[PDB]
């Protein structure tokens, strides 16, 4: 079976370099061209160019002429994409894709490699309580502010409280940091007796926070 | 893009839908090397049509394609939930170069409209005591998964300091989003109230909070 298998996610600072690999199997590598396609956040697929695997001649679309290099290593049937002097706007999922013929382009695709370029540095979150106070139920939560990189996970009362929990996907701020919130809906009658604690875990910074959320 | 597609199309299960792809340049020449790709998020795109109309074995026979003039069309019949995805047309454009269309988001309307529920929290005293202030507007249980969010200081629009997420699919197949308004503590206390206004399918739900 034709397979194109790409290397894993990359997180880079501007100015850094990155090299994405695209390992093929199931066919003769030098028989078919290897193309590269990008998808930036909130954008569509964009054709970047291709390399001829018999001649080594690369073709770059405008927009990808200057800092991009297509290469390959026939000894391991692998194609590479190298980007010099990375920019924030290089942030995208990069795909390799084979062309079979002019009539049949991009018949097999790699699974994609996410390359994130950000000036942000690792940072644990600041956790603030979202104090309670429709109907007999009250909403309380935790604001998980200014962290990097993803991910964060939130539980409530060490996993004992699961019903009514809504943990929202993080917003990516212009500063490059993330913030998210988790909120739980509970009986208003319980606010006097039951303690509510959000358990925040940010592994990239080796930080955990248990934040007690009380009324007033 | 060199190939123009509608940003979005929608249909109900069972219906047929068509997605157009119009060349804006004579670089396509005879415009007979047009292919289509289905793209589910986080997965590799999949070839579903090539040379305008050829559907390969291993692609669903509900996919078809045609062209008229410089407009190629993809048609999906017997619409099913798993057809929900992005769809891209693609053309050869001479001298061993290719180009993709801008993409079309296909929504399969598999459930009824659902208005968003909105919860708005003011800044916490702890954050205020750290000389920062964040309003938190949480938006849940809406369908279709598109909203726009506007903020107001009292009755006046506020655009500075607003960060809003894209909609994300919930486990119950409705959508959620959140929006954050960053203020100084002094801005927060200087107004009678702030409002988060969520617009969904032509109607608006607004929640208000006040320093006290």
């Amino acid at each position: 079976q034709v397979q194109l298998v790409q290397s894993g996610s990359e997180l880079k600072k501007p100015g850094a370099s990155v090299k994405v690999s695209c390992k093929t199997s199931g066919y003769t590598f030098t028989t078919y061209a290897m193309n590269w396609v990008r998808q930036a956040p909130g954008q569509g697929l964009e054709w970047m160019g291709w390399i001829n695997t018999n001649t080594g001649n690369p073709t770059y679309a405008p927009g990808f002429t200057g800092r991009f290099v297509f290469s390959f290593d026939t000894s391991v049937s692998t194609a590479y994409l190298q980007i010099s002097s990375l920019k924030a706007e290089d942030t995208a999922v990069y795909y390799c894709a084979r062309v079979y013929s002019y009539g049949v382009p991009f018949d097999y695709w790699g699974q994609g490699t996410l390359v994130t370029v950000s000036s942000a540095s690792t940072k644990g979150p600041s956790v603030f309580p979202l104090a309670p106070s429709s109907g007999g139920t009250a909403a309380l939560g935790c604001l998980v502010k200014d962290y990097f990189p993803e991910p964060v996970t939130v539980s409530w009362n060490s996993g004992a409280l699961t019903s009514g929990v809504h943990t929202f996907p993080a917003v990516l701020q212009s500063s490059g940091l993330y913030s998210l919130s988790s909120v739980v809906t509970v009986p208003s009658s319980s606010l006097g007796t039951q303690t509510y604690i959000c358990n925040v875990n940010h592994k990239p910074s080796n930080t955990k926070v248990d934040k007690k959320v009380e009324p007033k | 893009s060199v190939l123009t597609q509608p940003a979005s199309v929608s249909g109900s299960p069972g219906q047929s839908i068509t997605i157009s792809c119009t060349a804006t340049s004579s670089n396509v020449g005879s415009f007979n090397l047009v292919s289509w790709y289905q793209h589910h998020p986080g997965k590799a795109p999949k070839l579903i049509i090539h040379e305008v109309s050829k559907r390969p074995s291993g692609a669903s026979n509900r996919f078809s394609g045609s062209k008229s003039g410089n407009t190629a069309s993809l048609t999906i019949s017997g619409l099913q939930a798993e057809d929900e995805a992005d769809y891209y047309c693609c053309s050869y454009v001479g001298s061993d170069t290719w180009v993709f269309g801008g993409g079309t988001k296909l929504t399969v309307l598999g459930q009824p409209k659902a208005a968003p529920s909105v919860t708005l929290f003011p800044p916490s005293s702890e954050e205020l005591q750290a000389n920062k202030a964040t309003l938190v507007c949480l938006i849940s249980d809406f369908y279709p998964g598109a909203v726009t969010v506007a903020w107001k200081a009292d009755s006046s629009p506020v655009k500075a300091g607003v960060e809003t997420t894209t909609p994300s699919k919930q486990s119950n197949n409705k959508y959620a989003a959140s929006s954050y308004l960053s203020l100084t503590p002094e801005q927060w206390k200087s107004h009678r109230s702030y409002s988060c206004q969520v617009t969904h399918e032509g109607s608006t739900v607004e929640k208000t909070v006040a320093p006290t």
């Binding site: 061209a33 695997t53 018999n54 013929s101 002019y102 | 020449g29 005879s30 007979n32």
Partner: peptide, 13 residues
């Protein structure tokens, strides 16, 4: 005109 069955990867020497 472009032959749809042609392979673009051929050595053009």
């Amino acid at each position: 005109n472009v032959d749809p069955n042609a392979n673009p990867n051929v050595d053009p020497n």
